[PDB]
């Protein structure tokens, strides 16, 4: 897969109720792409959470290369595997979210 987006960091750990913000990095060579944030489910399925251009939000950053993929008010069951994907599907590598129990 040539020039896929990256997604950082590899692991984000927060307590339930907190926000978590990943960064999808993608410099298109092609013009007109869409950038999707996805969740991987048990048997390797994907589900789409948000997109460029709900608790899940994508924002392009001022450098244009970068995109915050934000979760607001994380729940426990938000824990899991996430990635980003560009369409000029070129998939980023996977990262993880873990949402801890607030005692």
């Amino acid at each position, epitope marked *: 897969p040539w020039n896929p987006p990256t997604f*950082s960091p590899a*692991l984000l750990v927060v307590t339930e109720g907190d926000n978590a913000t990943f960064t999808c990095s993608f410099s298109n060579t092609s013009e007109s792409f869409v950038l999707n944030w996805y969740r991987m489910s048990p048997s390797n399925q994907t589900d789409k959470l948000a997109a460029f251009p709900s608790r899940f939000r994508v924002t392009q950053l001022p450098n244009g290369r970068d995109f915050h993929m934000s979760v607001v008010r994380a729940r*426990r069951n938000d824990s899991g595997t996430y990635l980003c994907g560009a369409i000029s599907i070129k998939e980023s590598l996977r990262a*993880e979210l*873990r949402v*801890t129990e607030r005692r």
Partner: antibody
Framework: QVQLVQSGAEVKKPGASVKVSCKAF????????IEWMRQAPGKGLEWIGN????????KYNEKFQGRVTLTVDKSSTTVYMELSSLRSEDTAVYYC?????????????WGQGTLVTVSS | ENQLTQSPSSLSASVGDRVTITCRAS???????LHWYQQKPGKAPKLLIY???NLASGVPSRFSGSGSGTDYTLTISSLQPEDFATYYC?????????FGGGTKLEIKR
């Protein structure tokens, strides 16, 4: 080829300060948080806190709320554990460690430990 | 904090025997977030089992883990001489992270 390299052992008087380093080899420094722990001689493991070089977020255990500062220097891919106002009780091997993909909170890679002895 | 309590703190058994170590959590833990370490003297702990029952990379299959809720166990089916060590459980369900007090495995004679 991941390895965490820690600073050498330190003998300290009560009231002094230690700064232990944890330098990361063999991966993108910002991808994983660094966890700090300690284990007094023949005891058991106690969590201190963590630093995520991604976003400079820290989590501390209430025990060490104030007395420990975790800081970073990304240039050198090092996280530092500074412990102030040392007690005899802080005599321990201090470990840094990190997770890997899908360890769900298991620590895959550990520093070699830094023995910090506090005594009058 | 969610205190972890291991039983017993020292156990005795022979090369070739089986042993079972217990880790009881003071509150219930999602099983994905409970893990086991082995520590030989002088050396750092090493991950053995993650998420209750999965062997870590390069861990022999004489090692296995089980349990849920508050009650987890670790089983070595076929003690080798290299396996006399201390074993620790750990939880990543809540902050603060907690570790059990340790079970030290000794050579019956």
């Amino acid at each position: 080829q991941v390895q965490l390299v820690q600073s050498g052992a330190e003998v300290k008087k009560p009231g002094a300060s230690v700064k232990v380093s944890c330098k990361a080899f063999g991966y993108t420094f910002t991808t994983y948080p660094i966890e700090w722990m300690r284990q007094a001689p023949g005891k058991g493991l106690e969590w201190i806190g963590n630093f995520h070089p991604y976003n400079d977020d820290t989590k501390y255990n209430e025990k060490f709320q104030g007395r420990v500062t975790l800081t970073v220097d990304k240039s050198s891919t090092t996280v530092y554990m500074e412990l102030s106002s040392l007690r005899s009780e802080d005599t321990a091997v201090y470990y840094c460690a990190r997770e890997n993909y899908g360890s769900h909170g298991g620590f895959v890679y550990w520093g070699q430990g830094t023995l910090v002895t506090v005594s009058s | 904090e969610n205190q972890l309590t291991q039983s017993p703190s020292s156990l005795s058994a022979s090369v070739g025997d089986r042993v079972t170590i217990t880790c009881r959590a003071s509150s219930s833990v999602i099983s994905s977030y409970l893990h086991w370490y082995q520590q030989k003297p002088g050396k750092a702990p090493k991950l053995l089992i993650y998420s209750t029952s999965n062997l870590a990379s390069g861990v022999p299959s004489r090692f296995s883990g089980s349990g849920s809720g508050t009650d987890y166990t670790l089983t070595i089916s076929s003690l080798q001489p290299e396996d006399f060590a201390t074993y620790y459980c750990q939880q990543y369900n809540s902050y603060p992270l907690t570790f059990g007090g340790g079970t030290k495995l000794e050579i019956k004679r």
